[PDB]
Structure formats: structure tokens, C-alpha cells
């Protein structure tokens, strides 16, 4: 029982040791920068062909190919430039909640309520796409899967544990324990040596891939966390929640920097993505319009309102040319 | 115009044709979601139907293909994955009548029924409710009074009144009584009765949906 109060003191110690470094808020630091207040984005392509809701999309490293997952049991690789379809992968489990596209472009990943992450081999001697490994070992449902490299994939489940897998062996290599609730999102640093996982416990945790230990813990959200994304520098990450609030945390400072909130928004956030420069924060919303937040000043530069139903998956290309927003209406839109 | 991407366009159109045909095949099947608290009821009802994640069972009755998604094994927060089943034709809910005295179980089943019935994703989804363990309820009701589970009950400890009271209690949870119909049935040892009841309910839901789209409702 003595441990409970001693831990409480340590929590107080963290707050005091971190209250000290909070000399000023970033709102004051950037009160003098020019506002980027004219961001009008028009739909450029309308990827069409899904027959049910879309829950995840991921861009390729080449900034042209994108993969979209849907509840109809199909994975489509789209050529963004010409609207063409490169492949149609029929999934074994129609319940897919995440999709990842390997950086090399050889493989794609999908997962969902089946509790299995499937790795597909895009480039084979035969013309069809085949499944290479069926990863198993999670009791809960898979929320997000991301590829560290051609052979290693990191995955988050709904049983409070995020895991890292070796594709060739098919066996779990490191287990990241410590969350008290369902984990919903994973974002990998540009160096691919750290990743941040956000859970339903309203806390975001920074892990280390090599040692499997929680390096830092961040809190401040009233409710669940649904999306997480790193800033390009890799020294900050933004998080989305169901209380209509986005926050920017710092890995080094250990504290909140800005709160992205507006009174008119009372809906949850389903996707958060950053722009190539880091000056635009693209946050998906359940009001049927994704919103472009200026990261440094917390003001809404612009709105994208081309969605019939709720925005679900949003991604920014590596080259920064386009922002693709998937939605439950079964249509993807490429917004430049 | 184009040089080698014309073949790519042909590939895209062929892929679109395959997806449309697959979508038609999927749309033909009727999807049912199975929920409950006691695993015994789920196992019995699944076995009665003609025949580690969520289990999908396929059975065909009267040339109508069915899909049943058992999500019992998924131990997680239900709110974050329940929305994936927004379009299901009907929800099959199983409750054990023999669990009224065992432990608070009946209260837990009522709580789950209230949670899913009034959820914002299933406003217009009919809920089929199966009360299992009828024979055990017959045997137990003679000795243990139904007063233990519901203090307010004032009735004879007989099967007909107790069963009617429990059904009335469960059917009273739906706050929205206009757009949703809670069909109730007591499970029978024969598989035929259960499958026929499910077929009647799903056909009624199909007719109601077709009328709703065409404006008559």
C-alpha cells in the first residue's frame, strides 16, 4: 500500500519539475510571425470504386501510389496521378481498420477485428498479389500498423499493448506494455528509432524500438486519443481526441505547447497529419469537413468540405504536393 | 494522347468490373450480428443454426444467404469498434433465463441490451432477442422465486407469468419505439424453429427497408 502514495508523490514531482521549465507559451513566441491565413485547397482527383466505408489510407514513399482499405474486403493501390487502379487485393477478413504501405513499395499491410496483421507481397514473379505472412499474437483488435523497414513492422492492438514483429520469422520480438486502455494510433519518427502510441486512457506514450521501454509519458486530453502524428523534425507530435481538441506535445520539453480548439467544433477527431514544412496541421473531423490548422498560431487557416459523411483517414504526401482524405462515403479525394 | 497507359486504363476498368461484381455478391447476403453475455447461449444458438478474433458463420435458409458475426471473443472497449457494424440488417441478442439468480447476471444482460439498443449507430436496426435456457428456467423457477432478481415483481411463481414479465422488462428498454421492433422468441430444442423465426424477422426487416426507400414509410 506504501507504493501507492509514493507513486503519487512522484507524479507530483513530475508536475513540479516540468512546471518549472514552462517559462512561456508558444502563443507568445510566435505572436509576431506573419499569419498564413489564405489556404484554399480544391479537389483535384476523386478516386472512386470502393463500395463501403473507408478506414485507412497510406501514401507511398514515391508520393504517387496510395493504398486504401475498406469494409468490402478490398485493398486498392491507386495511381494518384491518373486515377488508375494498380491492384485490387481481396482480403480474407472484411473487417479492416488499418493499412500500411512499405517504404520500399514491395509490401502492404492490413489489419482489423480478426486480430491478425496480413503482409502482402506486391512484386512477385506471378501477376497476382499474394500474402507472405499472417502475423498472429494479439488478443485485441489491430488499430494501426506501420513499417519500420522492409523486414520489421510495428503494430498496435486493442489489448493495451503495442508490438514489434519480425516479418520473416513471424514471431514477436519486443512487447511494449504500459498502456491501461485500447491503443488507437502509432506514428514513427523520421529516424525510425522511436514511435508514439496514443491510447483510450487519454495518455500518449513515447517508446524506444530497440529497448522496448516507455521513454516518456504525456497527458492532458480529457477523453480518448484517436490519431497521432509526428512533426517532420521528429521532436514533436500532435494528437487528436474525441473532445474536439488537438494538442502539440514536445518530446524534449515533456509538456503541451498549443491547444487547437474552436467552440463551434463539438465532434471527434479521426485523423491528424502534418504538412511537409510543419506549418500546416491537417486534422480530420466528424463534422464531415477536415480542417487545416496553422501549427504555430492555433488559428484555422482553411477548411476542406468535400465529404458526404465523416472524414476517417487523412495523409500528406512525402513531397508535400497533396493531401488525400478518405471518408465513410466510399470516396477518396486528393486535395492539392 | 496516351502511349502505354492505355493498357493500364484497360486493367483499371477490368479491376472495376471485378469489384462491382464482388460488391453485388456481398450485397446479396444478409448480415446479422450476434451479441450476448453468457457464452452458453451463444454456442447453443450458433450450433442450432445450420452449419482469436470474430467468427463468421455462413448458413443458407430458403435461398437467402446469411452472415453471422460473433464478436463475443473481442475483449476491448465496445464503443471503438461497434461502428463497423452500422449497416447490419438485424442484431441477434441472447440472454439466459437461468441466470436471473446466478452471480446480477440478468441485470448485466439488461445493461448491455440498454447500451446497444439505444446506441446512436443502431437507431433503425431491429434487435432479435432470444431467451435461452428455457428448460432450466422451468426447473429452477419452482424452487427459487423470481423475487431475488427483481424486488418489484408481484406475481405467481409460474412459468407463463415469469416468462412474460421478463420479456416485457427487456422489451421496455428501447426508448425509440417507432423506428425499431424488438422481436422476441424463446429458444426451442429444434433448430427449425429458431432458424424459421430468424428468417421471418429478417424478411420483415427487408420488407420494411424496401418500403422505407420507396417512400411508403
Amino acid at each position, epitope marked *: 500500500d506504501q507504493l501507492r502514495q509514493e507513486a503519487e508523490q512522484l507524479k507530483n514531482q513530475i508536475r513540479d519539475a516540468r512546471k518549472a521549465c514552462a517559462d512561456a507559451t508558444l502563443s507568445q513566441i510566435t505572436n509576431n510571425i506573419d499569419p498564413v491565413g489564405r489556404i484554399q485547397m480544391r479537389t483535384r482527383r476523386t478516386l472512386r470504386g470502393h463500395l463501403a466505408k473507408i478506414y485507412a489510407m497510406h501514401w507511398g514513399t514515391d508520393s*504517387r*501510389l496510395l493504398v486504401s482499405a475498406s469494409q468490402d474486403g478490398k485493398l486498392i493501390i491507386w*495511381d494518384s496521378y*491518373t486515377t*488508375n487502379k*494498380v*491492384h485490387a487485393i481481396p482480403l480474407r477478413s472484411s473487417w479492416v481498420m488499418t493499412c500500411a504501405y512499405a517504404p520500399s*513499395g514491395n509490401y502492404v499491410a492490413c489489419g482489423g477485428l480478426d486480430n491478425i496483421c496480413s503482409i502482402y507481397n506486391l512484386k512477385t*514473379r*506471378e*501477376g*497476382n498479389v499474394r500474402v507472405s505472412r499472417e502475423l498472429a499474437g494479439h488478443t485485441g483488435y489491430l488499430s494501426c500498423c506501420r513499417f519500420l523497414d522492409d523486414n520489421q513492422i510495428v503494430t498496435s492492438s486493442g489489448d493495451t499493448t503495442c508490438a514489434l514483429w519480425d516479418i520473416e520469422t513471424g514471431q514477436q520480438t519486443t512487447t511494449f506494455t504500459g498502456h491501461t486502455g485500447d491503443v488507437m494510433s502509432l506514428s514513427l519518427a523520421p529516424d525510425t528509432r522511436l514511435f508514439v502510441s496514443g491510447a483510450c486512457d487519454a495518455s500518449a506514450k513515447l517508446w524506444d524500438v530497440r529497448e522496448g521501454m516507455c521513454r516518456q509519458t504525456f497527458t492532458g486530453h480529457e477523453s480518448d486519443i484517436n490519431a497521432i502524428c509526428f512533426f517532420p523534425n521528429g521532436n514533436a507530435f500532435a494528437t487528436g481526441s474525441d473532445d474536439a481538441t488537438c494538442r502539440l506535445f514536445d518530446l524534449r520539453a515533456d509538456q503541451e505547447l498549443m491547444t487547437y480548439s474552436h467552440d463551434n467544433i463539438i465532434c471527434g477527431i479521426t485523423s491528424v497529419s502534418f504538412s511537409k514544412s510543419g506549418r500546416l496541421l491537417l486534422a480530420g473531423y466528424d463534422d464531415f469537413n477536415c480542417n487545416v490548422w496553422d501549427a504555430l498560431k492555433a488559428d484555422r487557416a482553411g477548411v476542406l468540405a468535400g465529404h458526404d459523411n465523416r472524414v476517417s483517414c487523412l495523409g500528406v504526401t512525402d513531397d508535400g504536393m497533396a493531401v488525400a482524405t478518405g471518408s465513410w462515403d466510399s470516396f477518396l479525394k486528393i486535395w492539392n | 494522347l496516351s*502511349a*502505354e*497507359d*492505355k*493498357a*493500364a486504363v*484497360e*486493367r483499371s476498368k*477490368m479491376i472495376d468490373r471485378n469489384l462491382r461484381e464482388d460488391g453485388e455478391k456481398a450485397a446479396r447476403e444478409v448480415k446479422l450480428l450476434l451479441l450476448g453475455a453468457g457464452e452458453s447461449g451463444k454456442s447453443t444458438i450458433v450450433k442450432q443454426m445450420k452449419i482469436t478474433g470474430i467468427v463468421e458463420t455462413h448458413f443458407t435458409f430458403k435461398d437467402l444467404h446469411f452472415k453471422m458475426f460473433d464478436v463475443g471473443a473481442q475483449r476491448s472497449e465496445r464503443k471503438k469498434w461497434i461502428h463497423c457494424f452500422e449497416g447490419v440488417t438485424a442484431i441477434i441478442f441472447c440472454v439466459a433465463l437461468s441466470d436471473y439468480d446466478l452471480v446480477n447476471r440478468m441485470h448485466e444482460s439488461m445493461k448491455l441490451f440498454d447500451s446497444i439498443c439505444n446506441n446512436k449507430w443502431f437507431t433503425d436496426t431491429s434487435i432479435i432477442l432470444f431467451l435461452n435456457k428455457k428448460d432450466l428456467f422451468e426447473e429452477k423457477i419452482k424452487k427459487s422465486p423470481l423475487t431475488i432478481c427483481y424486488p418489484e415483481y408481484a406475481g405467481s411463481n409460474t412459468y407463463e407469468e415469469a416468462a412474460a414479465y421478463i420479456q416485457c422488462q427487456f422489451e421496455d428498454l428501447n426508448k425509440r419505439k417507432d423506428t425499431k421492433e424488438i422481436y422476441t422468441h424463446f429458444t426451442c430444442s429444434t433448430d427449425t424453429k429458431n432458424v424459421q423465426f430468424v428468417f421471418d424477422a429478417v424478411t420483415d426487416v427487408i420488407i420494411k427497408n424496401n418500403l422505407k426507400d420507396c417512400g411508403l414509410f
Partner: single-chain antibody, 232 residues
Framework: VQLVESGGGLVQPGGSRKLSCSAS????????MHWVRQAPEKGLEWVAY????????YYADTVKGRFTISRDDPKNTLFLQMTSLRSEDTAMYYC??????????????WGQGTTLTVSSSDIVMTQATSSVPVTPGESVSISCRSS???????????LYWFLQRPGQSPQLLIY???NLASGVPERFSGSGSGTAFTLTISRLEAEDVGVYYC?????????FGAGTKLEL
């Protein structure tokens, strides 16, 4: 992945014959299938092309109207119907598979081919040299010229390179002028600007000897180069 062809034999002039190619080891339905013939002691020339789904069929001008190409996807076989055979049609007919999508490698696999013997506008592609003296361990370059610029608006130059070892089917080396095919050693390298093209072998070995070919895929009919032979 193997393609074995059938139907080759002596045919009297003016007759008919049907060539059959059976495919095993890959998804035939999703691959476009080509027919390429090689006259004895001569270069390659395109004959026909049937796309996936039988939607689009193209024929070469020499054999237009008298040749019929058809595919039976359920049985995984490709059919070439030959009518009114003439002396010019004596050649070894090769069967090639091509799939077209972004990043694809067309003409990756070539069948063994069968010999057919008959008894007694287009983009020209020119290879300057018939033969070049080459010795093992030395870099060499093969040149290729085209009548019309091959750089399409997309930004892709539709040039393909091929190697035919003596007594074997042609094999793909470089596709789209800069991309190495699967299974080809890195020593092969290709570069081109506008119409002038070059293929470079950094270090040559015994297997590299053979006749090299050029292909253009910008427009139909597809045309091949005369053929550059490397001998040790």
C-alpha cells in the same frame, strides 16, 4: 513460371496451321500476351498482341488480316491462327507475356519458342553496328537510334533492351531505358537522351555474349533493332 509452345512443323505454301502456347505457373488471366517471331539468321519482329480480357487486339502489318490471335483463359492456353502461309513467314515464333500497370516490367518472360518452316509510319529503330570485338573483363557500350523522339509527355522513355544468348530465348535486361529487370546482374546499365541511346556493360563475362536488341513501345506496331552481336 514457364511457357511452352506447340504447333511448329513443316507446312506447304498456301496452307493453314494453328500455333498453341500453354502457360503454367502464373496468373494467365491478368497478363497480356504477345507473339514475336525471328526469321533464321535475322532479327526479331512483332506479330500480334492480345491484352488481358481479350478487349484489345493488334496485329503487325505484314500479317494483318490473315493471322488470328485468341486466348482461352480457363485452360491457360494462347492460340495463334495462321492462314495462307507464305515463304516470308518461316521463323521461330516466340511467346512473350506482358503486364501493364504503373511500375510494371513488360516483356519480362519469353517462351522457348517453336520452329515453323514453309517450303519453297512505323518507327524505324537502327543499330549502327552489326558486331563488335569484345574480350572478357572490359566495359563495352551498344548504341541505338530512333527516327522519332521516344520521350512521351508522361516523362517515360519507352525503350526496352534485350539479350539473346546463343541457343536460348531472348531475355529482358533494361525496361523504360533506365530500370534494371529482375534477376539481371547490376553490371548492366542503360542511359539515353532524346533519340540517341546507349547500353553499358561495366564488366563482361562468358555468359554476356549474344545478340542485343532494341525495342520501342511508344506506338504500335512495335519495331525491333537489327541486332548487335558481341563475340569473344
Amino acid at each position: 513460371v514457364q511457357l511452352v509452345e506447340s504447333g511448329g512443323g513443316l507446312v506447304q505454301p498456301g496452307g493453314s496451321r494453328k500455333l498453341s502456347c500453354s502457360a503454367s505457373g502464373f496468373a494467365f488471366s491478368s497478363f497480356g500476351m504477345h507473339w514475336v517471331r525471328q526469321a533464321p539468321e535475322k532479327g526479331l519482329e512483332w506479330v500480334a498482341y492480345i491484352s488481358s480480357g481479350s478487349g484489345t487486339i493488334y496485329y503487325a502489318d505484314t500479317v494483318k488480316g490473315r493471322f488470328t490471335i485468341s486466348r482461352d483463359d480457363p485452360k491457360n492456353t494462347l492460340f495463334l491462327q495462321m492462314t495462307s502461309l507464305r515463304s516470308e513467314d518461316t521463323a521461330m515464333y516466340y511467346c512473350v507475356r506482358s503486364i501493364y500497370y504503373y511500375g510494371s516490367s513488360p516483356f519480362d518472360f519469353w517462351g522457348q519458342g517453336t520452329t515453323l518452316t514453309v517450303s519453297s509510319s512505323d518507327i524505324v529503330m537502327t543499330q549502327a553496328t552489326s558486331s563488335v570485338p569484345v574480350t572478357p573483363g572490359e566495359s563495352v557500350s551498344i548504341s541505338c537510334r530512333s527516327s522519332k523522339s521516344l520521350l512521351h509527355s508522361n516523362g517515360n522513355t519507352y525503350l526496352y533492351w534485350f539479350l539473346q544468348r546463343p541457343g536460348q530465348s531472348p531475355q529482358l535486361l533494361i525496361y523504360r531505358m533506365s530500370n534494371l529487370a529482375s534477376g539481371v546482374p547490376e553490371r548492366f546499365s542503360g542511359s539515353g537522351s532524346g533519340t540517341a541511346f546507349t547500353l553499358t556493360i561495366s564488366r563482361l563475362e562468358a555468359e554476356d555474349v549474344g545478340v542485343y536488341y532494341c525495342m520501342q513501345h511508344l506506338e504500335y506496331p512495335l519495331t525491333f533493332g537489327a541486332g548487335t552481336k558481341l563475340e569473344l
